[PDB]
Amino acid sequence: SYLFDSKDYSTFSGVVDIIVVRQPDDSLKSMPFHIRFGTLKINIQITVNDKKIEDVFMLMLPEGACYFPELNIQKKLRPSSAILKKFNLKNGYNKIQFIAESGKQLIEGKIYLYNYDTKLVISDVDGTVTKSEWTHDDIAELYTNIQKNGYKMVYLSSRPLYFYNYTQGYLKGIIQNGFTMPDGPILLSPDQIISSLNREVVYKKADEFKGALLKDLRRVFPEEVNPIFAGFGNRDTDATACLYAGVIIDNIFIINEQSQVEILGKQEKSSYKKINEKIQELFPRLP
Ligand SMILES: [Ca+2]
């Protein structure tokens, strides 16, 4: 908190976790790339899973945001399937690295590959994982068991970019009665990642930022699948975004100040503990 205030050498260097999805025709589609090279005034090379990607590169804009030069030359945050196929991604987590050649600066990141039939479970972070940092009791066990049954937890954050790396540590350092938070991408509300390449629509919203994020996530999947199975949040604005994103009302969970989880569709007040007891009824194992 007081580090940025005075150190001042903490502009964001890093990458926001990337999501890629294999379509049924074997093509690849990804969410927008958001990578920043801190205090750099250029080409960028990529290395995935400790393997350099030959003849693929990004450029940087004066403001610091990077993009893919792709001809129809348009500056693209979403690379083409041909670029993404050169990554040779594996299912689940992949290590990705970007090297800006000015000297040479390196940022490491995460890039996830899902199949079009993957079922995701969304979880807000502030107020949903954290308790207004204290964590709600028993969430790690629940989320762990949800992940065991075949779903992929996706975390949602609206914190400024300079807290992104911090946020990754907090989630990954949580321990409850031996359980930990399943690894998954932390998506960022588009209002926290503004740049010339994405001003167009983000600039013109208010509380639809979460909904815009959920639909940017929906659109890397084919329109004929409902990839978002369930949602965890703590404000009614979370439920509204889940509802407009196609999540059935029975799979929307909203926690309040005293850790009471309302299952909207059932008009049932519950808890992470009780929801975990019914994990197989509420989150049935996937084949
Ligand atoms: Ca919240």
Residue numbers in the entry: 10 to 50, 57 to 87, 92 to 121, 125 to 154, 167 to 321
Give sentences copied directly from the paper behind this entry:
This point mutant was originally designed for enzymatic assays to probe the role of D155 in catalysis and substrate recognition, as it was found to play a role in magnesium coordination in structures 3 and 4. Other HAD phosphatases have similar magnesium coordination, however we sought to increase our confidence in our modeling by determining the structure of a D155N point mutant. This structure (Structure 5) was determined in the presence of calcium. Notably, there was no observable electron density for the entire D155N residue, and the sixth coordination site of calcium was now occupied by a serine residue from the N-terminal helix from an adjacent molecule in the asymmetric unit. Overall, we concluded that Tt Pah2 coordinates magnesium using Asp155, in addition to other canonical residues in the HAD superfamily.
Lipin/Pah phosphatidic acid phosphatases (PAPs) are Mg2+-dependent enzymes that catalyze the dephosphorylation of phosphatidic acid (PA) to produce diacylglycerol. pmcLipin/Pah phosphatidic acid phosphatases (PAPs) are magnesium-dependent enzymes that are evolutionarily conserved from yeast to humans. They catalyze the penultimate step of triacylglycerol synthesis, through the conversion of phosphatidic acid (PA) to diacylglycerol (DAG). The remainder of the C-Lip adopts a Rossmann-fold, forming the haloacid dehalogenase-like (HAD-like) domain and harbors a conserved catalytic motif DxDxT, where the first Asp coordinates a Mg2+ ion that increases its nucleophilicity, and the second Asp participates in acid/base catalysis.
